[PDB]
């Protein structure tokens, strides 16, 4: 759901949608993520190690 459940009913949405919206929260549309989803989503995997 993401940020939606702090107001009430939580809505089912895939994760790749969620942080793709947080890109819209800094000033760049989804073009940054999906055009680089393989690498971009892989870095967070290594950052946690």
């Amino acid at each position: 759901s993401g940020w939606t459940f702090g107001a009430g009913a939580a809505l089912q949405i895939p994760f790749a949608m969620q942080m793709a919206y947080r890109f819209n929260g800094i000033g760049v549309t989804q073009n940054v993520l999906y055009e680089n989803q393989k690498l971009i989503a892989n870095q967070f995997n290594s950052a946690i190690g």
């Binding site: 790749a16 999906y34 055009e35 989803q37 393989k38």
Partner: protein, 35 residues
């Protein structure tokens, strides 16, 4: 490269501006080409 994309058609907002123009000119063709 994008993941999750699905094939979908994109409509043209300019398309309705041209569909209403072809019908009018089709009638005149038969009135002058044959003779």
């Amino acid at each position: 490269v994008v993941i999750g994309i699905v094939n979908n058609t994109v409509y043209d907002p300019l398309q309705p501006e041209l569909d209403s123009f072809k019908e009018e000119l089709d009638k005149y063709f038969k009135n002058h080409t044959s003779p």
